[PDB]
Amino acid sequence: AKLETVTLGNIGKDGKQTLVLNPRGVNPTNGVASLSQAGAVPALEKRVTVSVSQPSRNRKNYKVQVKIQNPTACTANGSCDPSVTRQAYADVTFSFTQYSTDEERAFVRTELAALLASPLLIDAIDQLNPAY
Amino acid sequence: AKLETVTLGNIGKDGKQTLVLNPRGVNPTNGVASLSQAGAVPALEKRVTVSVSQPSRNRKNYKVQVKIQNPTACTANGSCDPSVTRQAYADVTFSFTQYSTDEERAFVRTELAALLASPLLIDAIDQLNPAY
Amino acid sequence: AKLETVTLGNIGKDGKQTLVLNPRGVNPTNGVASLSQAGAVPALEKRVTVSVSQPSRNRKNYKVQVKIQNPTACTANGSCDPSVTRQAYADVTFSFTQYSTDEERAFVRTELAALLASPLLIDAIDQLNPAY
Amino acid sequence: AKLETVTLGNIGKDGKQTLVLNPRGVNPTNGVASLSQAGAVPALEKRVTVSVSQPSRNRKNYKVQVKIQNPTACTANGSCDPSVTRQAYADVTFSFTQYSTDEERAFVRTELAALLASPLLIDAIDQLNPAY
Amino acid sequence: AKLETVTLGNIGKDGKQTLVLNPRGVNPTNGVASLSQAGAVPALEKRVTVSVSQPSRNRKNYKVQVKIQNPTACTANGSCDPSVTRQAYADVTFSFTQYSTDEERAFVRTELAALLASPLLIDAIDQLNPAY
Amino acid sequence: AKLETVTLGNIGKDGKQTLVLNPRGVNPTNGVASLSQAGAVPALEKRVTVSVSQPSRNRKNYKVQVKIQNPTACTANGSCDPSVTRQAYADVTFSFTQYSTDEERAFVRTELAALLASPLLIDAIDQLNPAY
């Protein structure tokens, strides 16, 4: 799963904009991989972090944590540094039994990708529409 | 958010399998959508929960969670009553503040679909890979 | 009483403004339709709640309820994300006998629209004068 | 808002009927003033009664309460009390704060008239149809 | 089982078509899906509604409840407001197994449809005869 | 309501099976039909019973109830005495006034058969799809 630049295009309500997710690296103390390198000033900018586990004797499974961060910087009208006042984002945790089938794992992946394109979740997220 | 036409396509390594969910109602006391058209029996295995998109004064901030179960059950040796042995489960929280806009919420939802489509999450899930 | 956009023509003291009440859905634990215009997580959000129901046979009658909310606040000067501090609203409950026809129920609905547009209710706002 | 006769045209199921509500006054210890059919008996049958604040001792608030009743009087089997019939009232409240503007209040009054004319309330009231 | 108008007939002893249940929608708090005849007055119509299930994992029994109401009303000796003097009724609940099933329920649904034509019920129900 | 073996055709999803319910006497109360299937195991597992309306008395001692019970066994290889692992069931209650013609009684049984054959209940019961 080489941490190569990921470009996610055709995103937003109408599928019109893009995000560059250019890798900062993988953390040596915890296995966490993260995508940044936007050229933009830190903590105001959009970031994507994906961490993984090993099929450890203490878990019997493999996990993937996918967290997307797209905070808004605001900026007080005065002083110095800008700062985030608004959070607007999501965190997907996956669990795959170490003895699971790869296709089962592959289904879970795309099932979410497909739900994210489903009118029910589109309305629940973009319009904040109550299900029914 | 009307419950209708929810089919998840491009499921699996080949991008060819589908799962039909077309939710047909929500939990009457919680506002929780129940997604599965797997079959009279398979609907007890292949399941998606999407909730709670219903707004409130005691929520302020907006949150939706999606719970995806894609289990395989094994038939008893020489008997009735098959049961699940393997998952292949995902659970995502979408969390936006009280003042968030639709474009940012949408950005993330479509960003996740694009991210799932991206090779980084294909090898992370199918080969269980750290990002190298 | 479908979850279709309701466009309200000419409103306000001089009959000049209009609303587009983009439907969101029915809040399932409450059973009430909800329309709102921007789709932002609400504070300063126009909101319309509508329902028709059949109470249990302790009440033995039919009801329709409508609530129209008009929140407002001043600018969060020097910062971001202003809250709602003031709200005006309509709240109408229509209580009907189960043996009544649609036409009389309609008279109650239509007479109110005709009366709301009449000089007495115009003065009970414009001047804020008491009724005699 | 001293009462005056109000002619409510374009009313009922087809939006084509006319009903005239003539004033009935009392010093409004009971804040509700009355507009009703000329009578003598119909005056006590089809009526709208209206209370306009005059905020209470709690310094709350500007409001208007309109109560609309349109019974079907019926003469049958030799009786002498046709005026005793089917209920009830549409209880209408225009709810405001203390220093709401006249424009804010007017929107509530005219938005409601505009919504009463909308298919959403037409079907909820005449056919008693649910939002689905 | 999307609600749609249901036409029923050859129900009475004359073999004639009778019954059409038109308005549709589901009360989401109650889990009750309508169909009915009240073109104007609800209190005089015929109704068939179904309780629409979604069992917990501690039951898995998707009970379907078919509620049948067939009231008869009179004016006859009066000028207005017909009201119910007699009512025929049925209430049928269908159980489901803990692992679900398929054909076995089809047998129960169709067994009952066939059973209702059995000479034992024709007299046990039409003449109220004890079986004997 | 003479006791005779009841033979019902049109059973199952394709309408091709036949179920035969042989009398087992009437003593829960006189006339409560007890009809069971053929063979030692079906004699334990599959049956239909029918309740009995009484001579006047307070109208509590009424309501024909048809109970369709279809438990089914599973066996070990070479096992003697099969036992139930699944049960399908229909709890069918009828209610009439003591004055309800003869026609209404017939009407409700056939209306129910007409509903059971309807796509609305085919999907609610065989496909487990809520009627939304």
Residue numbers in the entry:
A (entry chain P), B (entry chain G), C (entry chain T), D (entry chain J), E (entry chain Q), F (entry chain H): 1 to 132
What do the authors of the reporting publication say about this deposited model?
The coat proteins (CPs) of single-stranded RNA bacteriophages (ssRNA phages) directly assemble around the genomic RNA (gRNA) to form a near-icosahedral capsid with a single maturation protein (Mat) that binds the gRNA and interacts with the retractile pilus during infection of the host. The canonical ssRNA phage Qβ has a genomic RNA (gRNA) of 4217 nucleotides, from the 5′ to the 3′ end, encoding the maturation protein (Mat); the major coat protein (CP); the minor capsid protein A1, which is a read-through extension caused by a leaky stop codon for the major CP; and the β-subunit of the RNA-dependent RNA replicase (Rep). Like many other viruses, the CPs of ssRNA phages can also assemble into virus-like particles (VLPs), which are not infectious. Through a native infection without engineering the amino acid sequences, we found that Qβ CP can form diverse VLP capsids, including the T = 3 icosahedral, T = 4 icosahedral, prolate, oblate, and a small prolate form elongated along the 3-fold axis.
Besides the 5-fold non-icosahedral capsids, Qβ can also form a small prolate VLP elongated along the 3-fold axis, which is a new conformation of the virus capsid. In the elongated face, different from the 5-fold capsids having the same triangulation number, the 3-fold small prolate consists of two different triangulation numbers, Q1 = 2 and Q2 = 3. Moreover, the triangulation number of the two caps in the small prolate is T = 1, which means that Qβ has the potential to form a T = 1 icosahedral VLP. However, we did not find the T = 1 capsids in this study. The elongated faces of the small prolate consist of two triangulation numbers, Q1 = 2 and Q2 = 3. For the oblate and small prolate VLPs, there are two types of hexamers in each form. The “over arched” type, which provides more curvature with a θ angle of ~130°, includes hexamers from the oblate and small prolate VLPs. When produced from an infection event, and purified via size-exclusion chromatography, the population of the oblate and the small prolate forms are around 21% and 3%, respectively. When over-expressing the gene containing only the cp and read-through (referred to as A1) fraction of the Qβ genome from a plasmid, the percentage of the oblate and small prolate forms increase further to 35% and 12%, respectively. Two forms of these VLPs, namely, the oblate and the D3 symmetrical small-prolate forms, have not been observed before.
